[PDB]
Design an enzyme around this catalytic site. Structure first.
Site, PDB file in Angstrom:
ATOM      1  N   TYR A   1     -28.624   6.064  29.153  1.00 22.81           N
ATOM      2  CA  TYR A   1     -27.914   4.916  28.606  1.00 22.81           C
ATOM      3  C   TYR A   1     -26.494   5.371  28.260  1.00 22.81           C
ATOM      4  CZ  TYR A   1     -27.913   0.241  26.311  1.00 22.81           C
ATOM      5  OH  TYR A   1     -27.664  -1.079  25.980  1.00 22.81           O
TER       6      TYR A   1
ATOM      7  N   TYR B   1     -30.301  -2.883  22.103  1.00 18.39           N
ATOM      8  CA  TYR B   1     -31.260  -1.944  22.630  1.00 18.39           C
ATOM      9  C   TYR B   1     -31.351  -0.743  21.647  1.00 18.39           C
ATOM     10  CZ  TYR B   1     -33.765   1.172  25.800  1.00 18.39           C
ATOM     11  OH  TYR B   1     -34.663   2.064  26.345  1.00 18.39           O
TER      12      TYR B   1
HETATM   13  N1  LIG Z   1     -32.909  -5.872  30.447  1.00 15.60           N
HETATM   14  C1  LIG Z   1     -33.161  -4.995  29.481  1.00 15.60           C
HETATM   15  O1  LIG Z   1     -33.973  -4.098  29.618  1.00 15.60           O
HETATM   16  C2  LIG Z   1     -32.438  -5.104  28.175  1.00 15.60           C
HETATM   17  C3  LIG Z   1     -33.020  -4.324  27.017  1.00 15.60           C
HETATM   18  C4  LIG Z   1     -32.242  -4.515  25.810  1.00 15.60           C
HETATM   19  C5  LIG Z   1     -31.116  -5.330  25.799  1.00 15.60           C
HETATM   20  N2  LIG Z   1     -30.665  -5.988  26.874  1.00 15.60           N
HETATM   21  C6  LIG Z   1     -29.464  -6.809  26.695  1.00 15.60           C
HETATM   22  O2  LIG Z   1     -29.609  -8.149  27.170  1.00 15.60           O
HETATM   23  C7  LIG Z   1     -28.324  -8.660  27.549  1.00 15.60           C
HETATM   24  C8  LIG Z   1     -28.347  -9.243  28.952  1.00 15.60           C
HETATM   25  O3  LIG Z   1     -28.624  -8.236  29.919  1.00 15.60           O
HETATM   26  P1  LIG Z   1     -29.824  -8.399  30.984  1.00 15.60           P
HETATM   27  O4  LIG Z   1     -30.740  -7.204  30.816  1.00 15.60           O
HETATM   28  O5  LIG Z   1     -30.372  -9.799  30.848  1.00 15.60           O
HETATM   29  O6  LIG Z   1     -29.085  -8.294  32.409  1.00 15.60           O
HETATM   30  P2  LIG Z   1     -28.334  -9.561  33.053  1.00 15.60           P
HETATM   31  O7  LIG Z   1     -27.479  -9.070  34.193  1.00 15.60           O
HETATM   32  O8  LIG Z   1     -29.350 -10.649  33.321  1.00 15.60           O
HETATM   33  O9  LIG Z   1     -27.354 -10.044  31.866  1.00 15.60           O
HETATM   34  C9  LIG Z   1     -25.986  -9.638  31.821  1.00 15.60           C
HETATM   35  C10 LIG Z   1     -25.083 -10.838  32.071  1.00 15.60           C
HETATM   36  O10 LIG Z   1     -23.835 -10.708  31.376  1.00 15.60           O
HETATM   37  C11 LIG Z   1     -22.790 -11.199  32.223  1.00 15.60           C
HETATM   38  N3  LIG Z   1     -21.478 -10.600  31.888  1.00 15.60           N
HETATM   39  C12 LIG Z   1     -21.124  -9.316  32.047  1.00 15.60           C
HETATM   40  N4  LIG Z   1     -19.848  -9.164  31.630  1.00 15.60           N
HETATM   41  C13 LIG Z   1     -19.407 -10.369  31.210  1.00 15.60           C
HETATM   42  C14 LIG Z   1     -18.129 -10.875  30.648  1.00 15.60           C
HETATM   43  N5  LIG Z   1     -17.068 -10.055  30.452  1.00 15.60           N
HETATM   44  N6  LIG Z   1     -18.060 -12.189  30.334  1.00 15.60           N
HETATM   45  C15 LIG Z   1     -19.112 -13.004  30.525  1.00 15.60           C
HETATM   46  N7  LIG Z   1     -20.271 -12.554  31.032  1.00 15.60           N
HETATM   47  C16 LIG Z   1     -20.440 -11.267  31.375  1.00 15.60           C
HETATM   48  C17 LIG Z   1     -23.234 -10.847  33.631  1.00 15.60           C
HETATM   49  O11 LIG Z   1     -22.722 -11.755  34.610  1.00 15.60           O
HETATM   50  C18 LIG Z   1     -24.743 -10.959  33.553  1.00 15.60           C
HETATM   51  O12 LIG Z   1     -25.129 -12.245  34.045  1.00 15.60           O
HETATM   52  C19 LIG Z   1     -27.359  -7.487  27.462  1.00 15.60           C
HETATM   53  O13 LIG Z   1     -26.647  -7.564  26.233  1.00 15.60           O
HETATM   54  C20 LIG Z   1     -28.244  -6.265  27.427  1.00 15.60           C
HETATM   55  O14 LIG Z   1     -27.595  -5.232  26.687  1.00 15.60           O
HETATM   56  C21 LIG Z   1     -31.303  -5.895  28.049  1.00 15.60           C
HETATM   57  O1  LIG Z   2     -34.048  -1.246  29.470  1.00 13.39           O
HETATM   58  C1  LIG Z   2     -32.975  -0.930  28.586  1.00 13.39           C
HETATM   59  C2  LIG Z   2     -31.739  -1.744  28.924  1.00 13.39           C
HETATM   60  C3  LIG Z   2     -31.527  -2.209  30.225  1.00 13.39           C
HETATM   61  C4  LIG Z   2     -30.382  -2.952  30.513  1.00 13.39           C
HETATM   62  C5  LIG Z   2     -29.447  -3.206  29.505  1.00 13.39           C
HETATM   63  O2  LIG Z   2     -28.327  -3.930  29.782  1.00 13.39           O
HETATM   64  C6  LIG Z   2     -27.147  -3.385  30.208  1.00 13.39           C
HETATM   65  C7  LIG Z   2     -27.014  -2.004  30.320  1.00 13.39           C
HETATM   66  C8  LIG Z   2     -25.811  -1.473  30.769  1.00 13.39           C
HETATM   67  C9  LIG Z   2     -24.750  -2.329  31.085  1.00 13.39           C
HETATM   68 CL1  LIG Z   2     -23.195  -1.672  31.665  1.00 13.39          CL
HETATM   69  C10 LIG Z   2     -24.877  -3.704  30.970  1.00 13.39           C
HETATM   70  C11 LIG Z   2     -26.080  -4.228  30.527  1.00 13.39           C
HETATM   71 CL2  LIG Z   2     -26.189  -6.016  30.388  1.00 13.39          CL
HETATM   72  C12 LIG Z   2     -29.643  -2.750  28.207  1.00 13.39           C
HETATM   73  O3  LIG Z   2     -28.711  -3.014  27.238  1.00 13.39           O
HETATM   74  C13 LIG Z   2     -30.795  -2.012  27.920  1.00 13.39           C
END
Ligand SMILES: NC(=O)c1ccc[n+]([C@@H]2O[C@H](COP(=O)([O-])OP(=O)(O)OC[C@H]3O[C@@H](n4cnc5c(N)ncnc54)[C@H](O)[C@@H]3O)[C@@H](O)[C@H]2O)c1
Ligand SMILES: OCc1ccc(Oc2ccc(Cl)cc2Cl)c(O)c1
Ligand SMILES: NC(=O)c1ccc[n+]([C@@H]2O[C@H](COP(=O)([O-])OP(=O)(O)OC[C@H]3O[C@@H](n4cnc5c(N)ncnc54)[C@H](O)[C@@H]3O)[C@@H](O)[C@H]2O)c1
Ligand SMILES: NC(=O)c1ccc[n+]([C@@H]2O[C@H](COP(=O)([O-])OP(=O)(O)OC[C@H]3O[C@@H](n4cnc5c(N)ncnc54)[C@H](O)[C@@H]3O)[C@@H](O)[C@H]2O)c1
Ligand SMILES: NC(=O)c1ccc[n+]([C@@H]2O[C@H](COP(=O)([O-])OP(=O)(O)OC[C@H]3O[C@@H](n4cnc5c(N)ncnc54)[C@H](O)[C@@H]3O)[C@@H](O)[C@H]2O)c1
Ligand SMILES: OCc1ccc(Oc2ccc(Cl)cc2Cl)c(O)c1
Ligand SMILES: OCc1ccc(Oc2ccc(Cl)cc2Cl)c(O)c1
Ligand SMILES: OCc1ccc(Oc2ccc(Cl)cc2Cl)c(O)c1
Lengths: 287, 287, 287, 287
Positions: free
Chosen positions: B182, B172
């Protein structure tokens, strides 16, 4: 089914334009070549003579499908922009409708609206001098032909593109880090281009839903590379020795990326500089 | 075929993991899920009760195919790292082979070598606190789970992967620019992840001919996103109003990029942070 | 004791050129003004008339020491470069030796070798049009006057500088992130400039031991800022509301940094873009 | 006067801490040293035996002045964080008030509020191993000591600092580009540090009107540099051959930049990574 791409900047098959044409062909994209007038007739001759037949092979199934080949000069935006010396020139006198607006009109008149645009061209009269010894005329020439030409191409071609179309150009890391032999304001031209890619992404995305990105390619031994001051032999040796991936960089490596960025698969990517260089850009110290 | 992907970080069908799975499925890639034990049972029951049937529909021509579902905790490198309390915990007591090493060995024993690896996980005990107010434990927790986990997945999975394999993770923009909300050292963790991506591209490229890249995704309303407190509706609303591309960012938009970076078509890309965010990152001032 | 700085780009006292002159004065640096011919006589008149007396006060002790004020046009590299329309122009006909080479020669003939050089000027005939609607003539004009002018100034002034001299120019973050009203190829010009700063740093550092850096300033309500399309009123309000440091940005804030970078204190800094903008550039999401 | 600086990370006169101290002394800033307990006694004895007398000479007009020397361990936030074993350790048994909070309180009780803070420390148990081979413990150790320590110093020292105070730390380019040999998660730590610098510039600027920046220094043959294994002679030799400025990088070169960023003269700079490395960072390919 129904995809058409104009590729501006093909002189022969040793450049990135050809590699892009090849990969797009794998997807059945109809290809149109924009060829710089000085090298148009020679290209046409070589083609007619079968010099490129082997290079057109995609695989067992098919040969590259070139829809058309047109003279194209990025120096001139419209018919009004051509001067007497060019009008009266051996190679130009025998062609027409090769300014950017004329090419857009002519393509639109022949094949309709297109949805993929490729800028794969650069020039700089003073590329062999270092930045500090480059004249105003030399500097501006490099920017005119290597950077402004992208903006012009967008201004004129957007009228003839479909919503959700995609545009790319090619850049080099010399815009961001110092490459000694990359002179004549080419480093400058590339810096403007990567920035212009952002600004254009804003306007084209908000106003037309069109994406634009740029590919920062590693070294390829092409016509224009050979014009720089062995430089290209050095660049390639160094890259193959120090890049994270010790593999020969191919024009189709860039082509496969160009193809993805020009497709719907990259619907959410715009205004980006994507590095396709076997990771070389990430290194600080050679090891 | 012979394309197998392990996706680490799936709990439901609302995150980027699901979107990556769906897109990979469209290309006939075999999918193996690694599910954190706290939500593994709830995941399995929903699946068995056909709660995800709708979400698995691809074309209406096609439907997702899942090779295997495995308990996985990226906190633990090997069996010897598991603390007595966790191993006897109600949600862990019943599960086995869930450390990074054991999941690697398990997959290898059951299916042989794989060629695609996805890190799609993050966690931080103190994400609700701003950086200045984050404790040492919280900060280290965030780095341990969100960043170190990537390095560890690499160390153990590189033994069960073929040359020319590809690895992606998700990051991110808060790593590069300030995003209030964040917290917890999440920004810190994503900055480390993005730097570790380069360092690992070096080692993995030279020693194994394996690529690694990271996708910097825009806002998606996932389970984890809501846990930030609201923050995500704000991010989404801002993105849909100010991004060059004003369209709703979908999980499958990230999926298709992930799929490209995992395939042989991005052979020459490694160590990069690729932005898939409708171009928001390129903006300075709003309108 | 014995420091001389040429400041190219002073029209009045509301710009960054004046703020730089003021701070340098605190260090007893002898100041020379390069003033654009169209505004030379008006400037001279205002000065003679005491309009700037208050603005020249440094503090209890002293008034700014202006060594000289010279007409200077960055459009022209040498005497040969001036066209008939300019030679015959109301404001120019009455001046001479105002091309970049002539100014270098004239300063050298009057005061000897100097050791501090400041580029604090930009222009773009089409700044009020967006990039996509900017003509070739408009684009190249912006690059000619805002970017090439830096290279020329270095080429000609290095002959008249001491080893260990220092050079700066002023840039804006619109080169790196999209600023909607910053049109006419100014974003492009600034991108070229920041890159040129690197390339120049290489050549000037290796060949002459001279440093060059660029300052990326925040918004100041100057003459030229008022020419952009309220834009400047917006920029300033936003900056004061969202920058990490909620303080009015002053031209002397940039001046104190310019002064440091032009001194020996920054002996180890070259080819850099230094942000002086109350930290605004670090923000992603307004809060 | 009333300028007091706490410098955290000094063990001898061979590092950047000493160079920062000397430069600050030249500006009549009061210097307080925070010394890691493992080397505190050896530091004091050398000092008392006049072993540093030579190194404290400024102009031969002037000599360094040191307000106080304090035991300091950036591992420990508060007294309650100190583990039984450490508190009874031979080198710690004899010392008191050495946690971040206690050193803050102590300084405040003895001298009141300070306005300058320097983080000049790093550590990593596993620096000798490349990133892929770094253990979880090693990686977390590196982040804890080299990065978290900065956030913690900020949290506790902001209560004993005046508004318009300034904070600097030191970083290395291996955060942004790959440097083989910079192992242990040190690259990871410096990337986090450089991101945390932005996040903290936000909080500290808005809530306290306090600036924070980081200096990315070139290679210096310090005590810690030799512990990397040789690596540093290589880095130095490479830098002196390929940097735009081919002169020996001195600790006091960093000192004078640090001094500028700590003074009121850089009022408008915050959240930046400032490179002081003879411009090496701007280079791509060597000659
Ligand atoms: N959703 C957003 O806006 C966004 C934006 C940028 C990046 N991301 C990134 O995408 C990735 C997934 O997040 P998301 O947004 O899909 O939410 P999400 O909840 O769908 O994905 C997170 C997953 O990681 C798993 N997890 C957490 N700790 C763990 C561990 N110790 N071992 C194994 N699994 C574990 C959780 O069970 C969960 O299913 C993250 O790295 C997040 O930083 C998300
Ligand atoms: O929209 C921006 C954004 C939303 C969700 C995100 O995912 C996480 C944010 C905080 C934690 Cl503790 C765990 C995860 Cl998977 C992320 O990285 C960035
Ligand atoms: N070859 C490399 O190592 C390398 C590395 C990075 C980027 N690039 C970029 O890739 C692009 C393609 O160049 P290439 O490397 O394939 O070499 P190339 O010579 O095959 O392509 C350059 C083409 O630009 C055309 N051209 C020049 N001036 C023109 C004008 N005024 N109007 C229209 N066309 C003109 C030439 O005819 C030529 O065919 C260029 O933009 C180049 O900067 C190349
Ligand atoms: N004001 C801002 O908000 C701001 C923000 C970032 C950068 N800058 C930069 O700071 C620099 C100084 O501009 P300013 O903001 O102080 O406004 P300014 O109007 O005070 O300075 C611009 C000067 O450039 C001169 N100039 C224009 N064309 C010229 C030519 N062909 N030859 C010689 N001189 C010419 C003008 O006479 C004018 O005095 C500019 O480069 C600008 O891009 C300004
Ligand atoms: N020397 C270089 O080439 C170089 C290049 C870039 C950055 N740096 C940075 O400069 C800073 C200082 O390193 P240096 O090169 O001057 O070597 P140095 O040994 O002079 O400085 C490191 C100091 O930090 C102290 N320290 C270590 N752990 C500590 C803890 N837990 N609590 C308190 N103090 C502790 C050590 O006693 C030592 O005195 C480091 O942050 C380093 O990353 C150095
Ligand atoms: O290996 C690096 C490299 C090689 C070739 C390139 O293309 C050109 C370079 C200069 C000129 Cl005049 C024209 C072109 Cl098409 C380029 O941009 C970068
Ligand atoms: O607040 C942002 C900002 C304001 C003014 C600026 O200076 C110019 C802008 C356009 C033109 Cl034609 C000339 C100049 Cl001197 C600038 O660069 C950025
Ligand atoms: O020349 C590059 C360079 C040399 C030394 C450095 O400092 C350290 C490196 C490793 C460890 Cl464990 C501790 C420290 Cl203080 C550093 O950061 C960068």
């Amino acid at each position: 089914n129904e995809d058409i791409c104009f590729i501006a900047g093909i002189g022969d098959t040793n450049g990135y334009g050809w590699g892009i044409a090849k990969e797009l062909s794998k997807r059945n994209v109809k290809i149109i070549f924009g060829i710089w007038p000085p090298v148009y007739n020679i290209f046409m001759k070589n083609y007619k003579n079968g010099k490129f037949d082997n290079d057109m092979i995609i695989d067992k199934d098919k040969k590259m499908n070139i829809l058309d080949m047109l003279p194209f000069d990025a120096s001139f935006d419209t018919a009004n922009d051509i001067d007497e010396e060019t009008k009266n020139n051996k190679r130009y006198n025998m062609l027409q409708n090769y300014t950017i607006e004329d090419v857009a009109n002519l393509i639109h008149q022949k094949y309709g609206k297109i949805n993929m645009l490729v800028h794969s061209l650069a020039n700089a009269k003073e590329v062999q001098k270092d930045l500090l010894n480059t004249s105003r005329k030399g500097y501006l020439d490099a920017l005119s032909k290597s950077s402004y030409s992208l903006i012009s191409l967008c201004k004129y071609f957007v009228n003839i593109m479909k919503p959700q179309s995609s545009i790319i150009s090619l850049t080099y890391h010399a815009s961001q880090k110092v490459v000694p032999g990359y002179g004549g304001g080419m480093s400058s031209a590339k810096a403007a281009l990567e920035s212009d890619t952002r600004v254009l992404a804003y306007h084209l995305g908000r106003n037309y839903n069109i994406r634009i990105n740029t590919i920062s390619a590693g070294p390829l031994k092409s016509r224009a590379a050979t014009a720089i001051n062995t430089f290209i032999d050095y660049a390639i040796e160094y890259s193959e020795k120090y890049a994270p991936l010790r593999q020969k960089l191919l024009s189709t490596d860039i082509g496969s990326v160009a193809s993805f960025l020009l497709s719907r698969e990259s619907r959410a990517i715009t205004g980006q500089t994507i590095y396709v260089d076997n990771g070389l850009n990430i290194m600080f110290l050679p090891d």
